[PDB]
Amino acid sequence: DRLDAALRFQQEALNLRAQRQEILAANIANADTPGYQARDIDFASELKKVMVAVDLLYRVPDQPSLDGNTVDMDRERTQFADNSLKYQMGLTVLGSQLKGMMNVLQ
Amino acid sequence: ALLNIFDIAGSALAAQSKRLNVAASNLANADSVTGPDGQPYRAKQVVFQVDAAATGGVKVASV
């Protein structure tokens, strides 16, 4: 179970990154739906709660729009790129840790 | 110290988009005789600021 927890920290980080990526993809796909509210989650607090069933928050709008659509484009695109990069970083960290654990048994 | 680049560039993109929106609004309402209440339309423009928590991205203060 020690191995379980030691890899569990990074596994949960990766899982939350995947969930945030899914939400970003959803609000990209629905970017032109009138009456839509941009949704996002707070990664740090969510990870803390999971380590110690996911709630999502409404993104603060930046400009008004008559059709009731508040999901911006540039901010969420930068968020998408950042989330993808951090997901890849978590993936490679987990892979390095697993390979280091494995090669000891050789 | 390399993940702040995304924040800086995103702030720049948002500020430029806001400036473009303001310019488009001015061009559209170049010949607006009146608004809803009755007061004549007045040209608007943004006011940038340095988004330093030291230098960082650009940030729009108000209109």
């Binding site: 509210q37 928050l57 409404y58 603060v60 400009q63 911006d72 | 948002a14 809803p36």
Partner: peptide, 21 residues
């Protein structure tokens, strides 16, 4: 707060009145 941040409750509806009553 600052645009692009996160907040607990949603934005109010946006309206474009042609003439104020």
């Amino acid at each position: 707060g600052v645009p692009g941040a996160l907040s607990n409750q949603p934005a109010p509806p946006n309206e474009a009145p042609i003439a104020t009553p």
